[PDB]
């Protein structure tokens, strides 16, 4: 029942068969007062007389483009969305949840203050989006990030392909700190051509960070069929590597964790592969880097 | 604080009596409310103007402590509630004191557990204005069913009647006990004495002296002494022994355990716990029994005949103690002659001329000394057949038992005064390493039942002699307890023909082949082409026999010879074969 | 060094928070209710930064190595000391109050308390109780993580 | 004729559908679906051949008001229409099949299928299963408790196809939606695998003491329904074999799992071969093969030293430094007491196990790794006779029969050493006259039980004696036999 932006209103309808819709009033943004024509794009013919038209909304037939008009000149218009609601819980059919029953998966590569937030849309017929930091207090942490971009990744869940939209966001503080006390909270505004959806998320960027696979892996040949496997810290990871440090999982193809940059192991007939996790938290681990024995 | 969403309040208190009900009121800061009750941290219980202040009544609180969480789902606050009872009035109040130098402690029964932290106080009062008091905290971890008071009042002043009281306090309701009284003349439990030693005197294991050091006020004492033969302990009482006692009628050369308990007064005080068990070794004693000595008469020659010396001791009454020396004396009765020797073992051999009578004696010399010289008058090994008894019948109902019955001889049984029965094994030649084993049976008893030093499936030889000082009787026969079928038969070794008689000679079939007493042999001979029943000759077994004659057969016709060894319980199968054409 | 003691402190604090999560699961110890004990001398979270991560510069000791001497990082060490002081004081208070009642479901193992004590030696010189312990742990875990980070960067 | 059985409904949360069946030829059909209502307002959809038009919520269709659907089919110069239908579209919901991989668990005559479904509400569940050679059969799943759902099936002996479907049952215990479509097929294998006779090739071990086993590549086929591919219900996932050596048990247990059809080096020992097949539940069953032991023809030297409280055996091993295993098996008895060691000589204490008068098998194995069967080398499995063999080697029942006027024949039953290979070597028979003027010896192979003495002088008494000989000690003579002619 509220105004989303200049000359566009979003209302709510109780998505249930035996309940009645809401009543809204629309005024033509014109000081001239007389009998006027109102018309939509969902139906033909004049629908409203007078500058102030009262219309009831209970269905997606009742929403859209409402224009106040006379003669050959267009006076003004307004745009009317909806917002599905069932049993007091809002209905979210624009985005599809991941394997983890969550909607927005945000991930960062390091501690620079930057991340990317990906979600799984279900169709592509006229989707519009928005990212903003839903901050209440003046002390709440603020992101300053922009436009969403489609990503060519088509990921398969339940034997069906869904398209990953992504956004590349960057947090900012006037001067850095050592740790994060207030979480980053983000509000998403999905919209399919009339339908409106609000999504939310909240996270510290220390429990989502995902490192990169090791870049320079080599396998030095030793006596008694033993081998020296070596890697390196990824360059995208933060600096210095003494204040921020990793913890590599090593497996041969049950895995063993190390903190040095070289290891003694022996092969079995396949590959040897390492990961790169953050040593403190259970922040998610990178992808493997391998050499074939 | 932490309950930033409001508060929770209880009525009447977080501590309640058993089975009651409690009002719980949740209040929210101005501008659904569920209750979570958990039993021992286990979920078993579950469920705006009214939500600003919501009151509930809770009953049926189980035995223990439980948590109510008032959750608006986000939590608001909570309170930890506990249930309990007032302590039971204690019962069975007792107190303990340890000897002349020992403080007073006490013990009591607290009864039921309140599942809550309680405490107890212990008041001691007594005449001449003596008093003391200490407390103890009993909770979910530590239990106070005993306490020490820590004051050592004088036990010599035993003319006071003192008062013990124990009182229980908790958060819910106090409780008390009976104002118990105790007579101080019997509150003291004496400590066990020390320096309990055993001194050996009178050169006899029955006599000893037992010493100990204790308080000189002790009037009653008891001693426990016993050997290791039985778990029963011999008790003895004593009044005013004053640290020393004498012990008579003790089994000699027997290890003993010694324990002691004290008592200060016949009508006062209490007994004493037994001290450490003392292991004491009783010295030796001189045996007074008589050991029989057995002999043999093997005739090397008329003037150099062999006499054996055998004995066996198997009871700790004739060879008790560290016995090492055996002085053996052989005396001639007809003429004054004797021979002496020193032996360490149970067997000996001697060479004596056959002329003259004999008396054989041996001593039993332990560390204490030599026992009575065991002597036996000796007659000839085998005498006349007039006093020789009839055929002794041996019956074996067990694999390790033979019952032998000897009929009285044709001579009257008044002459015989003692019967000697000896068993031994058999060998192809002469045996001296294995001793013959003996027993004694009076003539008045009918039979003899031997169940020792006997092994089934070996043929043994028994002998019985009627012992007389002039000329005893002698008889012997062979037998075994249990025998089975022999595994095979011996060999027809040598064959000869002479003076119209055909002689067959063999050797001695070894010991494991018999598996008992071999009783006879059966020799079967026939013709080579004769498939009918072979004709048979019977040989009764004799140990000295190794050859057998047979009559003349058909000349110029070949004959086949074989044999079997037959006992009572079985028959040996066919052995080797012989072919002979006379 | 303080580095190995700090690793020991992290390991024992992780063990304790594991025990608290296992035991006080019915209690609010999951969500976060993230608030820390200290707010005035909070220069732990502002000064304990490396050299090349200063973008605006406006905002004695034994484990400060001579190879990495600075006129800034001493403030980080002092703030670590004061935070450890407050944490040990209220942890001693919660441990003392934990045994005045008959609940023995959570027992603070003295490993982290002796680790804090040795760290102090090295650096310088009802139902509300369970909730206060829980929030103290939920802030102390990230505080010991920060202290490990800064000790590893400084000493090495 | 014409269109019939119109049915529109809702699929997923934000999409709708309609379907109808035609009676008559479909050569040049065209179908139009007319949907309309009053708020009069009408709309048409054209599909042509296809019969699965979709109209999601923002296609200007009403989904919260009564609408009337009908279908018109256009053929040549003729139109025909089906029945009207009036219904809502929001609660006439078609529910999806159980999405994702549905888990199957096995038990005795039990197949338990568990699945997760997106909507937490419980729903009615039906199944339909097909045998490899028959048509389908139906079956209800009955009430369940719910998040997830569970269902049962009796496990048949061979493989079978099974399919599942649902329906969102209304709260009043009524059918509140159309039937769902079947999920993807679940093919389940036989509960017990009927094993076929696979082939093995026997090979005598070489001079070095190695035999070779190369399993052939063969496998039977299981008859399965049409849809059984890509899953272990069609064929078994993998074949395997398990080799076990029951000869040197002195170390820990070491059984080796090998893929079927590869070369393997095996010793001269008793082996157990298991042929197993891992299905989607686990290891199905076992095909048994028993390998008896063989021995190298090359006799090799061995030295022994027994007596007192000390026992040892010495030889010349190929190389020290590697762990060996020695085993003792008295061949003559039932091998009640087991005795082996895991350690060139070995020293140990004497016990009443190796001191009797029966033949012992001593087997020596050289080992390098207790994880594989290839590094166990057959050093020697030899036969020995402990104790005084001279007493046991004495022949029994020596019989002499006159053949001619100058020759006789001596025959005897074989000694205890004859049945024991590798120890008995020779029979020595001594013929000597009693006057001492003639002594002679005859040598007899151990495989002959008789001998003939020729050239014997007449009317002279002769004594004859027999013994048995071995490779280390002579034998005592028998009972002498006296004869004359
Ligand atoms: C995401 O979507 C949710 C919907 O689930 C949305 O919550 C809605 O927010 C709007 C605006 O924040 C609410 O509309 C308000 O309603 C209250 C009382 O109902 C009014 O007082 C408000 O009046 C405003 O507008 C007037 C006219 O312009 C002004 O005169 C006045 O001063 C106010 O500015 C306003 O109409 C709406 O009620 C909720 N829906 C609920 C509570 O169910 C949420 O805001 C969206 N965004 C985010 C970031 O979550
Ligand atoms: C609880 O409150 C009711 C009324 O407020 C009162 O009657 C009752 O006695 C109270 N119970 C307790 C245990 O205080
Ligand atoms: C015991 O408790 C009752 C309860 O009021 C009190 O009146 C009394 O004084 C108490 N007595 C003692 C000895 O504590
Ligand atoms: C759906 O909801 C409407 C609401 O009026 C009700 O009449 C109808 O029975 C429900 N069920 C179906 C199958 O239409
Ligand atoms: C269903 O989801 C649960 C999550 O609780 C998971 O443990 C299980 O593996 C899933 N799959 C099933 C039951 O087939
Ligand atoms: C074996 O027995 C024979 C016959 O008694 C004997 O002569 C020989 O010495 C014995 N040898 C051993 C080693 O016991």
From Swiss-Prot, chain A:
A GO CC annotation given for this chain: extracellular space
GO biological process: cell migration; cell population proliferation; cell surface receptor signaling pathway; cell surface receptor signaling pathway via JAK-STAT; cellular response to lipopolysaccharide; cellular response to type II interferon; defense response to Gram-negative bacterium; defense response to protozoan
Annotated GO MF terms: cytokine activity; cytokine receptor activity; growth factor activity; identical protein binding; interleukin-12 alpha subunit binding; interleukin-23 receptor binding; protein heterodimerization activity
Boundaries of every Ig-like C2-type domain copy: 1-84
Domain Fibronectin type-III span(s) in chain numbering: 211-286
Pfam entry (one): IL12p40_C
Keyword annotations of the record: Cytokine, Disulfide bond, Glycoprotein, Immunoglobulin domain, Secreted, Signal
Cell location: Secreted
UniProt key word Transcription regulation: no
Residues bearing glycans: 25, 100, 110, 198
Covalent S-S links between cysteines: 28-68
Domain of life: Eukaryota
InterPro entries per UniProt: FN3_dom (IPR003961), FN3_sf (IPR036116), Hematopoietin_rcpt_L_F3_CS (IPR003530), Ig-like_dom (IPR007110), Ig-like_dom_sf (IPR036179), Ig-like_fold (IPR013783), Ig_sub2 (IPR003598), IL-12 (IPR050676)
Keyword Signal listed: yes
Assigned protein family: Belongs to the IL-12B family.
Subunit structure: Heterodimer with IL12A; disulfide-linked. The heterodimer is known as interleukin IL-12. Heterodimer with IL23A; disulfide-linked. The heterodimer is known as interleukin IL-23. Also secreted as a monomer. Interacts with NBR1; this interaction promotes IL-12 secretion.
Protein name: Interleukin-12 subunit beta
Organism: Mus musculus
Gene from which this protein is expressed: Il12b
UniProtKB/Swiss-Prot annotation, chain B:
Domain Fibronectin type-III intervals: 89-187, 192-285, 286-380, 388-480, 486-582
Primary location recorded for the protein, binned into one broad class: membrane
Extracellular side: 1-582
Coiled coil: none
Tissue specificity remark: Expressed in developing T-helper (TH) cells.
Residue ranges annotated as motif WSXWS motif: 271-275
GO molecular function: coreceptor activity; cytokine receptor activity; protein kinase binding
One Gene Ontology term from the biological process aspect of the record: interleukin-12-mediated signaling pathway
Subunit annotation: Heterodimer/heterooligomer; disulfide-linked. The functional high affinity IL12 receptor is composed of I12RB1 and IL12RB2. Il12RB2 binds JAK2 (via its N-terminal) through a membrane-proximal region of the cytoplasmic domain.
Domains: entry comment: The WSXWS motif appears to be necessary for proper protein folding and thereby efficient intracellular transport and cell-surface receptor binding.
UniProt similarity note: Belongs to the type I cytokine receptor family. Type 2 subfamily.
Listed name of the protein: Interleukin-12 receptor subunit beta-2
Protein source organism: Mus musculus
Gene that this sequence comes from: Il12rb2
Residues represented out of the complete protein: 26 to 632 of 874
UniProtKB/Swiss-Prot annotation, chain C:
Pfam families to which the protein is assigned, alphabetical: IL12
One GO location term (cellular component): Golgi lumen
Primary residence: secreted
BP terms from Gene Ontology: cell population proliferation; cellular response to lipopolysaccharide; defense response to protozoan; immune response; positive regulation of T cell differentiation; positive regulation of T cell proliferation; positive regulation of type II interferon production; T cell proliferation
Superkingdom per UniProt: Eukaryota
InterPro entries: 4_helix_cytokine-like_core (IPR009079), IL-12 (IPR050676), IL-12_alpha (IPR004281)
Keywords in alphabetical order: Cytokine, Disulfide bond, Glycoprotein, Growth factor, Secreted, Signal
Disulphide bond pairs: 2-63, 29-134, 48-76
The name this protein goes by in its record: Interleukin-12 subunit alpha
The gene coding this protein: Il12a
Swiss-Prot record, chain D:
Disulfide bonds: 8-18
Entry comment, domain topic: The WSXWS motif appears to be necessary for proper protein folding and thereby efficient intracellular transport and cell-surface receptor binding. The box 1 motif is required for JAK interaction and/or activation.
UniProt domain Fibronectin type-III: residue ranges: 2-99, 99-193, 194-294, 295-390, 394-485
Function: Functions as an interleukin receptor which binds interleukin-12 with low affinity and is involved in IL12 transduction. Associated with IL12RB2 it forms a functional, high affinity receptor for IL12. Also associates with IL23R to form the interleukin-23 receptor which functions in IL23 signal transduction probably through activation of the Jak-Stat signaling cascade.
Membrane topology: Single-pass type I membrane protein
Record has Thylakoid as a keyword: no
Compartments, record wording: Membrane
Residues listed as glycosylation sites in the UniProt record: 5, 28, 77, 91, 116, 135, 265, 303, 309, 336, 388, 402
UniProt keyword list: Disulfide bond, Glycoprotein, Membrane, Receptor, Repeat, Signal, Transmembrane, Transmembrane helix
Species annotation: Mus musculus
Record-stated family: Belongs to the type I cytokine receptor family. Type 2 subfamily.
Domain of life: Eukaryota
Membrane-side (Extracellular) residue stretches: 1-485
Coiled-coil zones: none
Residue ranges of the motif WSXWS motif: 179-183
Subunit text: Dimer or oligomer; disulfide-linked. Interacts with IL12RB2 to form the high affinity IL12 receptor. Heterodimer with IL23R; in presence of IL23. The heterodimer forms the IL23 receptor.
CC terms in the record's Gene Ontology section: external side of plasma membrane; interleukin-23 receptor complex; plasma membrane
Protein name, as recorded: Interleukin-12 receptor subunit beta-1
């Amino acid at each position: 029942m509220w105004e989303l932006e200049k000359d566009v209103y979003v209302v709510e309808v109780d998505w249930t068969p035996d309940a009645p819709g809401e009543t809204v009033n629309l005024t033509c943004d014109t000081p001239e007062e007389d009998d006027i024509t109102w018309t939509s794009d969902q139906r033909h013919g004049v629908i409203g007389s007078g500058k102030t038209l009262t219309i009831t909304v209970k269905e997606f037939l009742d929403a859209g483009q409402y224009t106040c008009h006379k003669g050959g000149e267009t006076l003004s218009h307004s745009h009317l969305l909806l917002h599905k609601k069932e049993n007091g819980i809002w209905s979210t059919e624009i985005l599809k949840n991941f394997k983890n029953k969550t909607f927005l998966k945000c991930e960062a590569p390091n501690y620079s203050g930057r991340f990317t937030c990906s979600w799984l849309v279900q169709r592509n017929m006229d989707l519009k989006f928005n990212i903003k930091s839903s901050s209440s207090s003046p002390d709440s942490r603020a992101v300053t990030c922009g436009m969403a971009s489609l990503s060519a990744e088509k990921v398969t869940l339940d034997q069906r392909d869904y398209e990953k939209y992504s956004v590349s966001c960057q947090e900012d503080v006037t001067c850095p700190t050592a740790e994060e006390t207030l979480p980053i909270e983000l509000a998403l505004e999905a919209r399919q051509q009339n339908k409106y959806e609000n999504y939310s998320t909240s996270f510290f960027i220390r429990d989502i960070i995902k490192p990169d696979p090791p870049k320079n892996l080599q396998m030095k040949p030793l006596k008694n069929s033993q081998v020296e496997v070596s890697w390196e810290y990824p360059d995208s990871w933060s600096t210095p590597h003494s204040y921020f440090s990793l913890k590599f999982f090593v497996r041969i193809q049950g895995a063993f964790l190390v903190e040095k940059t070289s290891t003694e192991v022996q092969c079995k007939g396949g590959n040897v592969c390492v990961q790169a996790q953050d040593r403190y938290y259970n922040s998610s681990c990178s992808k493997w880097a391998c050499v074939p024995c | 604080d932490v309950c930033k969403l409001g508060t929770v309040t209880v009525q009447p208190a977080p501590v309640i009596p058993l089975g009651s009900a409690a009002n719980i009121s949740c209040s929210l800061n101005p501008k659904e409310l569920i209750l979570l009750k958990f039993v021992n941290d286990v979920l078993v219980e579950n469920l705006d103007h009214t939500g600003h202040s919501s009151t509930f009544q809770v009953t049926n609180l189980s035995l223990g402590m439980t948590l109510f969480v008032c959750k608006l789902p986000v939590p608001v606050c909570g309170v930890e509630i506990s249930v309990g009872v007032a302590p039971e009035p204690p019962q069975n109040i007792s107190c303990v004191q340890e000897g002349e130098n020992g403080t007073v402690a006490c013990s009591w029964n607290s009864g039921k557990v309140t599942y809550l932290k309680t405490n107890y106080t212990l008041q001691l009062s007594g005449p001449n204005n003596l008093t003391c008091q200490k407390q103890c905290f009993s909770d979910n971890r530590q239990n106070c069913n005993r306490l020490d008071l820590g004051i050592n009042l004088s036990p010599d002043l035993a003319e006071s009647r003192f008062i013990v009281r124990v009182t229980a306090i908790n958060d819910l309701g106090n409780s008390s006990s009976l104002p118990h009284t105790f007579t101080f003349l019997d509150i003291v439990i004496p400590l066990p004495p020390w320096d309990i030693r055993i001194n050996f005197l009178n050169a006899s294991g029955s006599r000893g002296t037992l010493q100990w050091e204790d308080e000189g006020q002790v009037v009653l004492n008891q001693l426990r002494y016993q050997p290791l033969n039985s778990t029963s302990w011999n008790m003895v009482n004593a009044t005013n022994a004053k640290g020393k006692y004498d012990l008579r009628d003790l089994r000699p050369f027997t290890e003993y355990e010694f324990q002691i308990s004290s008592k200060l007064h016949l009508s006062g005080g209490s007994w004493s716990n037994w001290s450490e068990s003392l292991r004491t070794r009783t010295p030796e004693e001189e045996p007074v029994g008589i050991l029989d000595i057995w002999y043999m008469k093997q005739d090397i020659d008329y003037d150099r005949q062999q006499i054996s010396l055998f004995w066996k001791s198997l009871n700790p009454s004739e060879a008790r103690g560290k016995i090492l020396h055996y002085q053996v004396t052989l005396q001639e009765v007809t003429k004054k002659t004797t021979l002496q020797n020193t032996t360490r073992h149970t067997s000996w051999t001697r060479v004596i001329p056959r002329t003259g009578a004999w008396t054989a004696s041996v001593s039993a010399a332990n560390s204490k000394g030599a026992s009575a010289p065991t002597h036996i008058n000796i007659v000839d090994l085998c005498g006349t057949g007039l006093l020789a008894p009839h055929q002794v019948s041996a019956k074996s109902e067990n694999m390790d038992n033979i019952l032998v019955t000897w009929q009285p001889p044709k001579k009257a049984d008044s002459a015989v005064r003692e019967y000697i029965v000896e068993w031994r094994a058999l060998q192809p030649g002469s045996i001296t390493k294995f001793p013959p084993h003996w027993l004694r049976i009076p003539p008045d008893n009918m039979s003899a039942l031997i169940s020792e030093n006997i092994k089934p499936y070996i043929c043994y030889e028994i002998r019985v002699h009627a012992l007389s000082e002039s000329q005893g009787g002698c008889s012997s026969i062979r037998g075994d307890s249990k025998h089975k079928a022999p595994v095979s038969g011996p060999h027809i070794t040598a064959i000869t023909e002479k003076k119209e008689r055909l002689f067959i000679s063999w050797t001695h079939i070894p010991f494991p082949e018999q598996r008992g007493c071999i009783l006879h042999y059966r020799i079967y001979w026939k013709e080579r082409d004769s498939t009918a029943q072979p004709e048979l000759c019977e040989i009764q077994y004799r140990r000295s026999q190794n050859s057998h004659p047979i009559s003349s057969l058909q000349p110029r016709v070949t004959y086949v010879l074989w044999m079997t060894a037959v006992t009572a319980a079985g028959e040996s199968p066919q052995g080797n074969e012989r072919e002979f054409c006379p | 060094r303080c580095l190995s003691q700090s690793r020991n402190l992290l390991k024992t604090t992780d063990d304790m928070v594991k025990t608290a999560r296992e035991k006080l699961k019915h209690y609010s110890c999951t969500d976060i209710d993230h608030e820390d004990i200290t707010r005035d001398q909070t220069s732990t979270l502002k000064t304990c930064l490396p050299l090349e991560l200063h973008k605006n510069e406006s905002c004695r000791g034994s484990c400060l190595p001579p190879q990495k001497t600075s006129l800034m990082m001493t403030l980080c060490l002092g703030s670590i000391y004061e935070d450890l002081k407050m944490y040990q004081t209220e942890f001693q208070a919660i441990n003392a109050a934990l045994q005045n009642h008959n609940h023995q479901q959570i027992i603070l193992d003295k490993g982290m308390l002796v680790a804090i004590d040795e760290l102090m030696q090295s650096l310088n010189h009802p139902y509300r109780v369970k909730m206060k312990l829980c929030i103290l742990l939920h802030a102390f875990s990230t505080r010991v993580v920060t202290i490990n980070r800064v000790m590893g960067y400084l000493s090495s | 004729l014409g269109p019939r059985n119109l049915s529109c409904y809702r699929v997923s949360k934000t999409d709708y559908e309609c379907s109808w069946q035609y009676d008559g030829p479909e050569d040049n059909v065209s179908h139009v679906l007319w949907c309309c209502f009053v708020p009069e307002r009408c709309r048409y959809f054209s599909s042509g051949p296809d019969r699965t038009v979709q109209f999601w919520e923002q296609d200007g269709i009403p989904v919260l008001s009564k609408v009337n659907f009908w279908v018109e089919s256009r053929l040549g110069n003729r139109t025909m229409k089906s029945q009207k239908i009036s219904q809502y579209l929001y609660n006439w919901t078609k529910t999806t099949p159980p999405l994702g991989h549905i888990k199957v668990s096995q038990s005795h005559r039990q197949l338990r299928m568990d699945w997760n479904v997106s909507e937490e509400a419980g729903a009615e569940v039906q199944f339909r299963r097909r045998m490899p050679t028959t048509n389908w059969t139906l079956g209800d799943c009955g009430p369940q408790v719910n998040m997830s759902e569970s269902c049962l099936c009796p496990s048949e002996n061979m493989a079978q196809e099974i399919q599942i479907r649902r329906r969102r049952r209304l709260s009043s215990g009524a059918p509140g939606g159309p039937w769902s479509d079947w999920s993807m097929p679940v093919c389940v294998p036989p509960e017990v695998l009927p094993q076929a006779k696979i082939k093995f090739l026997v090979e005598p071990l070489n001079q070095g003491g190695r035999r070779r086993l190369t399993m052939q590549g063969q496998s039977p086929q299981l008859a399965v329904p049409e849809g059984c591919r890509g899953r272990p219900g069609a064929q078994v996932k993998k074949h395997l074999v398990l080799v076990r050596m029951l000869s040197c048990r002195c170390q820990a247990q070491t059984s080796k799992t090998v893929p079927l059809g590869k070369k393997l080096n095996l010793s001269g020992a008793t082996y157990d071969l298991n042929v197993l097949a891992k299905t989607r539940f686990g290891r199905s069953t076992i095909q048994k093969w028993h390998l008896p032991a063989q021995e190298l023809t090359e006799t090799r030297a061995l030295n022994v030293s027994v007596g007192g409280n000390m026992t040892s055996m010495q030889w010349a091993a190929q190389a020290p430094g590697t762990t060996y295993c020695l085993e003792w098996q008295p061949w003559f008895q039932h091998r009640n007491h087991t005795h082996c060691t895991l350690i060139v000589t070995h020293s140990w204490s004497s016990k009443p196990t190796l001191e009797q008068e029966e033949c012992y098998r001593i087997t020596v194995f050289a080992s390098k790794n207790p994880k594989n069967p290839m590094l166990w080398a057959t050093v020697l499995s030899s036969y020995y006779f402990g104790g005084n063999a001279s007493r046991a080697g004495t022949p029994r029942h020596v019989s002499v029969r006159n053949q001619t006027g100058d020759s006789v024949s001596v025959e005897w039953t074989a000694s205890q050493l004859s049945t024991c290979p590798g120890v008995l070597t020779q029979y020595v028979v001594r013929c000597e006259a009693e006057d001492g003027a003639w002594e002679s010896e005859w040598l007899v192979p151990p495989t002959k039980t008789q001998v003939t003495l020729d050239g014997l002088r007449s009317r002279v008494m002769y004594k004859v004696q027999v013994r048995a000989d071995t490779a280390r000690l002579p034998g005592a003579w028998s009972h002498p036999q006296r004869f004359s002619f």
